[PDB]
Amino acid sequence: NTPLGGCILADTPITFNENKPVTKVKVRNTGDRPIQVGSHFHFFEVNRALEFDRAAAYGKRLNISSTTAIRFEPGDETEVPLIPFGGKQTLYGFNNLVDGWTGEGVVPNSERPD
């Protein structure tokens, strides 16, 4: 039995988007104010204050569940797994740093100077 509006949930955990590369990066908040980045935000077009390997985040979002965001306090250093965007991988907006195209590139991580 279960209460009103309850869910008799099956004993099985959910599996997220598999067969997609993962990139672990150490992100440290240099600024004196807190920063929180959402699931689908493009980390390459984030604040300049955050010190990390910027070049490794080409067309790559957070490797966490959709919707949710992870908070960074001033100074605190946190490791974050990153996953590449799906479909055509054509991003626009954020800070006018790239606005479209994809990097990718089989064998060399080249193109798009900044």
Partner 1 sequence: MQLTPREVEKLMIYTLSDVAFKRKARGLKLNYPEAVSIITVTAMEGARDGKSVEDVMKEASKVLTKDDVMDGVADLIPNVQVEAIFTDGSRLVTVHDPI
Partner 2 sequence: PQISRQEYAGLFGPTTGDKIRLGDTNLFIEIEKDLRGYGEESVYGGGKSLRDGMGANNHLTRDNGVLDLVITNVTIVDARLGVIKADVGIRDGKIAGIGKSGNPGVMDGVTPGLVVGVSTDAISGEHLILTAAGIDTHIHLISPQQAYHALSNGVATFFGGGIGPTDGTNGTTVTPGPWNIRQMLRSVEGLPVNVGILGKGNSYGRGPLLEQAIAGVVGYKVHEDWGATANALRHSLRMADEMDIQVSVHTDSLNECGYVEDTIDAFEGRTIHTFHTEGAGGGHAPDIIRVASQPNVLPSSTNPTLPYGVNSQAELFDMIMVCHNLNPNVPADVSFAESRVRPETIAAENVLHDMGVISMFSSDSQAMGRVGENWLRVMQTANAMKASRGKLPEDAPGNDNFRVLRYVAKITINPAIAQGVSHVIGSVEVGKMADLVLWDPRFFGAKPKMVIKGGMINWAAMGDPNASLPTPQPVFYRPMFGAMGKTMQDTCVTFVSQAALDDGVKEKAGLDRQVIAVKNCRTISKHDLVRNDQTPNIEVDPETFAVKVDGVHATCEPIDTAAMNQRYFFG
Footprint on this chain of partner 1 (rule: CB under 8 A): 3-6
8 Å CB contact between 49 and 30: yes
Question: Of partner 1, partner 2, none, which one does residue 96 interact with (CB within 5 to 8 Å by kind)?
Answer: none
Element (DSSP H or E) covering residue 71: strand 69-72
Minimum distance, C-beta of residue 42 to partner 2, in the bound complex (Å): 7
Residues 7-66 that bind partner 2 (CB under 8 A): 7-10, 12-17, 36, 38-42, 63-66
User: Which residue type is seen at 86?
Assistant: G
Tokens of 69: 């965001």
Nearer to partner 1 by Cβ, of 4 and 106: the residue is 4
8 Å CB contact between 5 and 39: no
- For the chain, the distance separating the N- and C-terminal CA atoms, rounded to the nearest angstrom, is 60
Nearer to partner 2 by Cβ, of 21 and 86: the residue is 86
Q: Is 78 one of the binding residues for partner 2 (CB under 8 A)?
A: no
What residues have CB less than 8 Å from 4, skipping those under 6 apart? Answer: none
Contact set with partner 2 (CB under 8 A): 2-10, 12-17, 36, 38-42, 63-69, 81, 85-94, 100-106, 111
